């Protein structure tokens, strides 16, 4: 289960690649949905948390790729450093992330395009299609999303690769459109939309079943802000492409963390500005369901701007879409070549010199998911998968820092006051055990803080006792990990506060995962069950290291 493997572009190019792969459906489509349903004008805060949670993850990646001379996805790093089972879990979560990201971005692009032409494809879908299961499936299937995914999968199978020039052009267009949006919001938008009261709880359109909430800047409270941040973590995904660049880099491991951090900061700035503009131009409740930014522009009289936004979004939603599709066959091929997945997925077609079968299977799965599930459901599913993957990466960073350089009974003095200057097998085992207990305890803390939120507010003895014990014991275990010596191995990039920052990253990721809906958790559970079935029935016995 724990078998381990034997292992130009400037910083600005990496930043461009990350920004192009990150900006997309998160801001052009989902920002309005979050600002209308989960948060209000406080969506700006929701992004901020979502930004920090991302940064904590990105920093880990910087160290998590610094320990492996080869450059590859997090699956390769895990399968080289920690173990087979952990690496399989990470790769399965990455596969879910990429597939569901393809599905969600394809849906967002299809919806935007259909909006741009008067919803004729949607009208055809309502007329001729219906799933008859709104409880778990989408109201209307997205046939055009399936068509887009089919076309792009065909392009990928025939050898189409990442065009850096086209990505840069589209990213420049998208950034110009976003800057225009921010300027137009600061010009036309007014602060009064952030101070609405019951006097203004009316919409010029006569839509019904509106959620007005408290009003003002935080209509739905900090719980709504946290849910909005969990949803907005969707937007910040896509920096992994910098770590999985593949192409040679001027600085193999020093530019990658800088590029990731710069891309995350730029994305946070853009999201903050655009969400503030959206919530200042139009009331949060008024935000159009079909297209929030064009609706806000129309509300202020700048209807023509809907064209400009349409130019920007379709660009971003394109660059993001490929950003979620190009890595998709690579992870599957890597896992299959290692034997964790079915070996037939690792067969490269001679004519195309590409993993045709893996690409086709991933594209079919993504097309089906985009056909059957709503945008928000896919968004939350990919968010939970990516959050688990990032938590796993942070745990790897926390663990590997204290393990001895590779080729039980214990005492209180040894555990708390080790005298060895460099890690020993005993210290590494202590850190492994402490990481496991800390993960379990953080899960308990998040469960009690979310499920028992009202109970904690009520002050019931059991909830308060459990929360206090869990938090203080988390601090104690973090101190235990703190006392253990760190590996003397020199690293090109390091997480500054390795005893705390990875722990905080894990805690934030798990909290955001808890913020998600029950249906998202059920879908994630069935996906993880499928992955475990594949690994324990096939992966263990057919592993290349067996």
């Amino acid at each position: 289960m724990l078998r381990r493997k034997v292992v130009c572009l400037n910083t600005y190019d990496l930043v461009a690649l990350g920004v192009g792969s990150t900006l997309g459906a998160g801001v052009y489509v989902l920002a309005g949905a979050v600002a209308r349903e989960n948060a209000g004008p406080a969506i700006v805060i929701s992004f901020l948390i979502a930004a920090l949670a991302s940064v904590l993850a990105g920093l880990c990646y910087g160290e998590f790729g610094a320990r492996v001379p080869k450059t590859g996805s997090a699956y390769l790093y895990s399968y080289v450093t920690v173990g087979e089972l952990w690496a399989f879990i990470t790769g399965w979560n990455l596969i879910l992330s990429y597939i569901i990201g393809t599905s969600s971005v394809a849906r967002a692009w299809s919806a935007t395009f259909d909006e741009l032409i008067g919803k004729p494809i949607g009208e055809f879908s309502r007329q001729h299609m219906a799933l008859n299961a709104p409880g778990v499936l989408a109201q209307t299937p997205d046939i055009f999303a399936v068509i887009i995914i089919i076309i792009l999968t065909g392009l990928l199978t025939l050898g189409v690769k990442e065009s850096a020039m086209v990505n840069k052009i589209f990213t420049c267009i998208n950034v110009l459109v976003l800057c225009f949006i921010v300027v137009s919001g600061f010009v036309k938008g007014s602060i009064k939309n952030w101070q609405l009261t019951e006097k203004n709880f009316s919409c010029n359109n006569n839509d019904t079943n509106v959620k007005y909430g408290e009003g003002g800047f935080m209509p739905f409270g900090f719980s709504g802000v946290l849910s909005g941040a969990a949803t907005c973590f969707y937007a910040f995904v896509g920096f992994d492409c910098i770590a999985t660049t593949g192409e040679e880099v001027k600085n193999p491991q020093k530019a990658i963390p800088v590029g990731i951090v710069a891309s995350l900061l730029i994305c946070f700035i853009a999201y903050f500005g655009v969400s503030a503009a959206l919530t200042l131009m139009m009331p949060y409740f008024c935000l159009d369901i079909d297209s929030p930014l064009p609706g806000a522009f129309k509300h202020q009289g700048w209807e023509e701007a809907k064209y400009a936004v349409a130019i920007g979004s379709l660009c971003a939603l394109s660059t993001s879409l490929l950003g979620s599709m190009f890595p998709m066959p690579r992870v599957i091929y890597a896992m299959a070549e290692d034997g964790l997945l079915f070996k037939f997925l690792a067969k490269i077609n001679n004519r195309t010199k590409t993993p045709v079968i893996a690409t086709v299977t991933s594209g079919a799965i993504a097309a089906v998911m985009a056909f059957l599930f709503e945008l928000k459901d896919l968004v939350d599913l990919m968010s939970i998968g990516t959050l688990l993957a990032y938590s796993l990466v942070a745990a790897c960073v926390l663990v590997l820092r204290y393990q001895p350089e590779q080729p039980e009974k214990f005492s209180l003095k040894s555990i708390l006051s080790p005298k060895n200057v460099e890690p020993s097998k005993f210290s590494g085992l202590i850190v492994n055990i402490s990481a496991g207990l800390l993960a379990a305890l953080i899960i308990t803390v998040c469960i009690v803080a979310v499920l028992g939120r009202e109970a904690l507010a009520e002050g019931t003895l059991w909830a308060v006792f459990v929360m206090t014990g869990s938090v203080l014991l988390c601090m104690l275990v973090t101190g235990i990990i703190w006392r253990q010596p760190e590996s003397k191995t020199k690293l090109s990039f390091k997480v500054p506060f390795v005893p705390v920052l990875p722990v905080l990253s894990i805690f934030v990721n798990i909290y955001l995962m808890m913020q998600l809906d029950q249906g998202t958790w059920v879908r994630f559970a069935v996906w993880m069950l499928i992955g475990f079935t594949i690994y324990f029935g096939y992966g263990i016995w057919h592993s290349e290291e067996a």
């Binding site: 709880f201 019904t208 079943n209 959620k211 007005y212 909430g213 002050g459």
Partner: protein, 223 residues
């Protein structure tokens, strides 16, 4: 002889917000005053959201889509969504539902303290801004788990409608937080009601425990 008697309930600004009338002899009619908790907040402290609402004004806020009138343009679905985050106040129907829940939850509620009519020994209970509830023990009545009572306070305040009876009234966009005020034997024996006696009411919540000041007075004429 018989007079046209009128019991009035006034907000903190001493403006009548509720009233009941009847033909009775003086100091013989002691009805159950049923002012709305939101009526006391009209033109009151900023927390309740009615600081700019005149007495006898209609309840503000858009109607709930679940109300008896059915769905309409701009109808609110907050009255069906969870009331956790909502602040207990009176500026919207869902906020009024949250206020009703707060006043009807066993772990929460509201408590009432007396004003100028309190004995001098209670002078350490604070001023009107404090709502005469500067510290525990000043409260004389209210709906709360400790169930306060006073052998000299002139009124007892409770919730008039149970939660179930009030949820639908809230969803109809009507005043749906009716208090029940009952004159005590000491209050029945008191005659200074012509000058008006004032109380402060504070919600028992995890936080500031925001409150208001209300008053009860008597008017009468020949009939």
């Amino acid at each position: 002889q018989v007079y046209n008697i009128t019991w009035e309930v006034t907000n903190g600004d001493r403006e009548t917000v509720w009233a009941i009338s009847g033909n009775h002899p003086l100091w013989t009619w002691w009805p159950v005053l049923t002012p709305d908790l939101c009526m006391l907040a009209l033109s009151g402290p900023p927390h309740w959201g009615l600081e700019y609402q005149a007495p006898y004004s209609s309840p503000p806020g858009p109607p709930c889509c679940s109300g008896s009138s059915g769905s309409s343009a701009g109808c609110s679905r907050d009255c069906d969504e969870p009331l956790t985050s909502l602040t207990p106040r009176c500026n919207t129907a869902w906020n009024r539902l949250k206020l009703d829940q707060v006043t009807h939850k066993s772990s929460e509620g509201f408590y009432v303290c007396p004003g100028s009519h309190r004995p001098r020994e209670a002078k350490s209970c604070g001023g009107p801004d404090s709502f005469y509830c500067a510290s525990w023990g000043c409260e004389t009545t209210g709906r709360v788990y400790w169930k306060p009572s006073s052998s000299w306070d002139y009124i007892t305040v409770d919730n008039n409608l149970t939660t179930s009876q009030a949820v639908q009234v809230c969803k109809d966009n009507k005043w749906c937080n009716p208090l029940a005020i009952q004159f005590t034997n000491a209050g029945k024996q008191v005659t200074s009601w012509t000058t008006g006696h004032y109380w402060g009411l504070r919600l028992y919540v995890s936080g500031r425990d925001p409150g208001l000041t209300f008053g009860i007075r008597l008017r009468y004429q020949n009939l």
